[PDB]
Amino acid sequence: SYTNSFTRGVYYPDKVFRSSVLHSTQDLFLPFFSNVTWFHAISGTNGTKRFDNPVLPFNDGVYFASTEKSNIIRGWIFGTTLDSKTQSLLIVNNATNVVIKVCEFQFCNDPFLDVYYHKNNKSWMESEFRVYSSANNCTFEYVSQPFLMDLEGKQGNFKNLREFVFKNIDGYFKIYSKHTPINLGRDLPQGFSALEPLVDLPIGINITRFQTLLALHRSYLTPGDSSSGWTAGAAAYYVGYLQPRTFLLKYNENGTITDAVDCALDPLSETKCTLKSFTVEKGIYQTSNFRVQPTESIVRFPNITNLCPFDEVFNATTFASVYAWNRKRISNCVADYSVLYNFAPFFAFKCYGVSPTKLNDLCFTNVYADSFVIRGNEVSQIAPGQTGNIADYNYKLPDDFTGCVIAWNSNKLDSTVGGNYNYRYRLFRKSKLKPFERDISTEIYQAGNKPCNGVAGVNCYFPLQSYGFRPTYGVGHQPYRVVVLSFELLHAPATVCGPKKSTNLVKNKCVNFNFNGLTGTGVLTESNKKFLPFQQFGRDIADTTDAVRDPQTLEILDITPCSFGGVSVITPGTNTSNQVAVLYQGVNCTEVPVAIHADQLTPTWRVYSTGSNVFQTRAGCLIGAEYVNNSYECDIPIGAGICASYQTQ
Amino acid sequence: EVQLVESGGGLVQPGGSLRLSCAASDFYFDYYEMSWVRQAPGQGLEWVSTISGLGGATYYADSVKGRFTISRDNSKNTLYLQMNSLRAEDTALYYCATRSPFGDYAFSYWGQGTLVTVS
């Protein structure tokens, strides 16, 4: 069977408490106005005619919904193949408790739960159990006490809809529930209630099949007890598959989900998901996405596994002085900066240019590392713009520097009682220095009078002044070993990226790919372009890229927009009505179905603009109105024409 | 504000070689990495090879990997580009630009350019 599923099934995205906000999350929700199955049930026969619908495939989620009573439906069977393969989640509801035993069960083709009479049992109902066959390897076995089937009891409980949403998204089987009565004489409510959170038993087994478990009073495998009330029964369980879609959920002051927008529906939903509101006004508003709904995210970040020897350029025998900085060029590495926080807590981790944290994602080309030691009084002079003693006549740093200077105290080994006279610095220079220079000159400086001809006499001295560190000095004079990391970004294949894992390269399908920091959403197809273009003349002020290079193999992939074409929605305000209009900028009223791909969209949009009441406009094809050959007043700017709309009627 | 005057070759024969030249006058920066950009008629512009300014590393492209060699010398403040084995595909107007290693991918010292064709 097939019916219409009204707007219902919106759950809480995450567990973070929020209020009076509008968060547009991207999870596995139920598409509004979808086609759910009103699968009924029968009785009498146990072997073949036990029900009406066989096992249903579990793709991403199931929106369970039943309106029966007397506790008929008290179970939801989950599993991959359900036959001695993987752990089968068996959520069997009981009189007072609910068993969520995740164990290996051999579910037969006809799973039924015989009705057990209410007596004093051993805190469970294992007396009547013919749904499964065996159980050997039992995993986590949540035994939550509160009833899962029903919550409250009243006179409107007979029409109460016990709805449940299931999803095993990488670690947690998020279950939801909302036990609310329906108005008398209605199968599905016309409200916009939301399912409250529930148990989150952590599992990791994949689910590919779903089966609704029913109950029977007495079975005899005869047609006489098929539909009689006693020893028989019948029920219905609505099933709706969840697809990846974006939803804008409204929050109240008490932290509950209010009315939401499908955002994958009639173009008014895309108008709601581009203004982040719920009451739109009269105005031509553009839409970009949320109508193709990509399903998989490609990373393909690294190509190597060898860790980077950052410890080699961070803890050596003895770093050189300030006038000779050891530049160790590092390439073909893995940028794992997690070891930078769990080894000898430093003084100041000041990362300029880029954010101090979130460095394990942004990938660079080559990473340089310096190594010198200065006093504590000048640990801040090594920074973009800062001047002083070591920042005027020694190692410096440019204004634009997307690196991270890091220092730490070293009074332990870099200071002796007698005096560590090895470390020296330059203070006698004629002119200034330029960034990344190594002046190792050991000449004699003289600028006040005639040169001493290199004798170091009166008013003539050596530029290197031994500032030997002593343990009796204060924290301002203690030696500090400072490493100046330099992160370059050249137009070359990157060699040192973060520890991000790899994925599968999906072709000819809308995905969310982030190869080397180029976060872009688009269909990746194979192109005949010889080499990857490098747009640098116009700088691409209001334009994005069109092609990227795969970091694993040297293949040239082309970035094509999934569903676009310059779609501008015309809505005369949600306050007036819900009669939206669609405008496609740059079509010819014949290429519109192939432009926005009118083949894998929502059925509510396959009737709004395909070929009905089209009009050829200079900007494109305004589909959704009628070109009335009359005169009107100023309306929403479409580009041309003031023809029929929600005005005047 | 430095102008990168380019020279070295205007026309060559298929299967030959000719050294180019890119001299910078007011080039006080010693870390700005220099590179070459070729724009053939038809499709857009591509990348030939770059020279790291912080050190002395040189990175080449995939088509000109083992046929093009580069060299930099700050004493005379110029850039040289060799063109060994120009068989059939090295027909483009090569440009000499310069950008900082720390920043965006766009250049900041777009020069005039020089044409090199083999036919």
Residue numbers in the entry:
A (entry chain A): 35 to 683
B (entry chain C): 1 to 119
Publication excerpt:
We first explored whether a previously reported bispecific single-domain antibody bn03 could resist the immune escape of the SARS-CoV-2 Omicron variants by neutralization and binding activities. Analysis of mutational events across SARS-CoV-2 variants revealed that the n3130v domain of bn03 contributed to its exquisite neutralizing breadth. This domain was found to recognize a cryptic region located in the spike trimeric interface. In summary, our study defined a highly conserved epitope on the trimeric interface of viral spikes that enables broad antibody recognition of SARS-CoV-2 variants including the Omicron subvariants BQ.1.1 and XBB, and emphasized a unique mechanism for antibody neutralization via inducing SARS-CoV-2 spike trimer decay and disassembly.
Similarly, the mixture of n3130v with XBB (XBB S-n3130v) or BQ.1.1 spikes for an hour resulted in extensive trimer disassembly. The complex structures of XBB spike monomer-n3130v (XBB S-n3130v) and BQ.1.1 spike monomer-n3130v (BQ.1.1 S-n3130v) were determined to 3.44 Å and 3.68 Å, respectively. The three complex structures revealed nearly identical binding epitopes that buried deep inside the trimeric interface of the spike proteins. The n3130v epitopes on RBD and SD1 are highly conserved between the variants of SARS-CoV-2, including WT, BA.1, BQ.1.1, XBB, XBB.1.5 and the newly discovered XBB.1.16.
